[PDB]
Design an enzyme around this catalytic site. Sequence first.
Site, PDB file in Angstrom:
ATOM      1  N   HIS A   1       0.812  -1.218   0.000  1.00  0.00           N
ATOM      2  CA  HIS A   1       0.000   0.000   0.000  1.00  0.00           C
ATOM      3  C   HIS A   1       0.858   1.287   0.000  1.00  0.00           C
ATOM      4  O   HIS A   1       0.295   2.376   0.043  1.00  0.00           O
ATOM      5  CB  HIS A   1      -1.086   0.028   1.101  1.00  0.00           C
ATOM      6  CG  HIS A   1      -0.581   0.163   2.506  1.00  0.00           C
ATOM      7  ND1 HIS A   1      -0.674  -0.886   3.408  1.00  0.00           N
ATOM      8  CD2 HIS A   1      -0.017   1.223   3.130  1.00  0.00           C
ATOM      9  CE1 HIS A   1      -0.160  -0.431   4.540  1.00  0.00           C
ATOM     10  NE2 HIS A   1       0.258   0.827   4.420  1.00  0.00           N
TER      11      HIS A   1
ATOM     12  N   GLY B   1       2.304   5.992   9.653  1.00  0.00           N
ATOM     13  CA  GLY B   1       3.743   6.008   9.429  1.00  0.00           C
ATOM     14  C   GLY B   1       4.391   4.722   9.918  1.00  0.00           C
ATOM     15  O   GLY B   1       5.453   4.347   9.423  1.00  0.00           O
TER      16      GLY B   1
ATOM     17  N   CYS C   1       3.535   1.612   9.344  1.00  0.00           N
ATOM     18  CA  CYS C   1       3.435   0.455   8.441  1.00  0.00           C
ATOM     19  C   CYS C   1       4.816   0.006   7.989  1.00  0.00           C
ATOM     20  O   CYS C   1       5.684   0.842   7.747  1.00  0.00           O
ATOM     21  CB  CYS C   1       2.520   0.748   7.252  1.00  0.00           C
ATOM     22  SG  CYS C   1       0.841   1.273   7.711  1.00  0.00           S
TER      23      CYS C   1
END
Lengths: 304, 304
Positions: free
Chosen positions: A41, A143, A145
């Site tokens: 993503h 942030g 991830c």
Amino acid sequence: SGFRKMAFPSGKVEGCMVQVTCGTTTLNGLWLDDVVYCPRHVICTSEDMLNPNYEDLLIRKSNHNFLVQAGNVQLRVIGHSMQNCVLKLKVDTANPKTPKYKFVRIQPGQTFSVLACYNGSPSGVYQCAMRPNFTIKGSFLNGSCGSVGFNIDYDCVSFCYMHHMELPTGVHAGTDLEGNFYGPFVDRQTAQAAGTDTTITVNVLAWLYAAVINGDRWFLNRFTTTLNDFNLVAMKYNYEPLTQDHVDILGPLSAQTGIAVLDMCASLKELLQNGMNGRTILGSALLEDEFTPFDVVRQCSGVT
Amino acid sequence: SGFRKMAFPSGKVEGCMVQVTCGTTTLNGLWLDDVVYCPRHVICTSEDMLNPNYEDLLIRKSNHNFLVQAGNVQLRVIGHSMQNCVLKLKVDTANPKTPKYKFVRIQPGQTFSVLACYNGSPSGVYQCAMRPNFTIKGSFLNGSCGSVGFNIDYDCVSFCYMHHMELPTGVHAGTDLEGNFYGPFVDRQTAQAAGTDTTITVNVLAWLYAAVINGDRWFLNRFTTTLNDFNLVAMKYNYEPLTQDHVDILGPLSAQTGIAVLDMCASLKELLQNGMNGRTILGSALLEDEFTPFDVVRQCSGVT
Ligand SMILES: O=C(Cc1cncc2ccccc12)Nc1ccccc1
Ligand SMILES: O=C(Cc1cncc2ccccc12)Nc1ccccc1
């Protein structure tokens, strides 16, 4: 003595954290050998997340659109590929800090350390469990991830989790290092339901053994029970059914304490039916289920 | 979202852990620059600990009697000195992994990360608080002495604690990195009493703010209180008296939530007088006091 929710020392994993940027999105990546692993993503914008076609989105991206930065030095991207929900960015430099590592898919009920990161920089480490519904109750902000979960066996790091999303319910979902989500979750901004979260019975029993080893014995009674009788009580309280495998796994703790597993089950049964009555166990007013029998033995024996 | 007892990433501290052996006793040491810091009780045998005369005991020891080992390489000891309850072994090689560091004496109520070690090897990391009675509720076994507590400010490690002893009551006592014990404790096998352990009120309030930020608002009521009225309730429940300093320190959390500090105090007052009624706050059935207002702001803002 003493019993704490202990995490593995994170140094081996800190040396693998990098920052991955794609357009306006910056998240964390895991640099092992000449490959940077991160959530796919990273290629999405806020609008894409509603219903992203990742194969179509990835086609508009070239090697040069993925900015990888380890500390203050920029890594050169020479290849990119999508493996399930993770992107693998091939870089031209092997990570000189790559520890001995494995990629493992953990079972629900198992525990692991999370190194929470922001902009490829670590901010904290905590110990958690893969819930039976495959969610994790972590501490992650935007942030975070690409932050990873792991276990260490002397010098070999077993990477088991990569953080991908926070569900509307506040719980966290992610993948193993092959991009496969734990649970039914998808990397899309949509109504996703986590199943019923049950209590890891074998873990609670292991923690009761840790309590006894550490001097907290108030909950020990003069009763015993059977697997079938205990399980009747476990189902009512949304506790995982205890199997002979779990009894065997509790064998070392049962031997160390001299308290039979079924005897500990009768104590657990009374704690479930009657509550703690305002008392605590290992500084907790509820039954703790985020220590496996392996975690208890390790903590109480000092495995480095 | 999510709220966890997070520890600082331990990598900077792992690179400083060494094994110090003196006769039959092996414990951990902290190698910074050309100095190895460790508990002075490394020079004691089981019999010495009853009433050790450390100056007399140290005189029978020479540089060559202190075996320092970092990983698998042996360090050469060229000097030894006693600074309060810590031994400083001067070595001929500076630690190439020495991070930017400070030695700080923390206040009771402040929190820090512990890197629990055995044979100079780290086994785990956990977050804890210096109790108002100067003890720590850690997880330490024999061999863990010399394990350190620290905080990190971006890249500077502030060493605040070195583990020395476990009191007969199961709680832990230790020193700052200048050898001064936190509290009245002495490094002797004798009857030592920790004072009454009170609850860090400002920390509990900070954790109530963390709960509100994370969606757990059930405990919020329509009431308010005053500092003097709240303190009357705090003294009865062995809670630290709340001062205007604590109110000011809670300022950022109060601004973030829009909930006045005295309003949060009235909620805390009702939680104290009435209990949680079987409910939980941030997955806990008791009032958590091991997160400072700084820890809450940091965790909820992602400071790396
Ligand atoms: O959930 C995340 C990232 C994330 C993770 N943990 C915690 C977060 C907290 C705030 C914001 C984002 C967080 N990404 C995403 C966004 C929309 C739809 C699908 C996935
Ligand atoms: O207490 C310690 C070391 C220690 C620390 N933490 C945990 C421990 C658990 C078991 C044994 C020892 C532990 N040293 C000592 C021994 C006698 C008298 C004065 C000090």
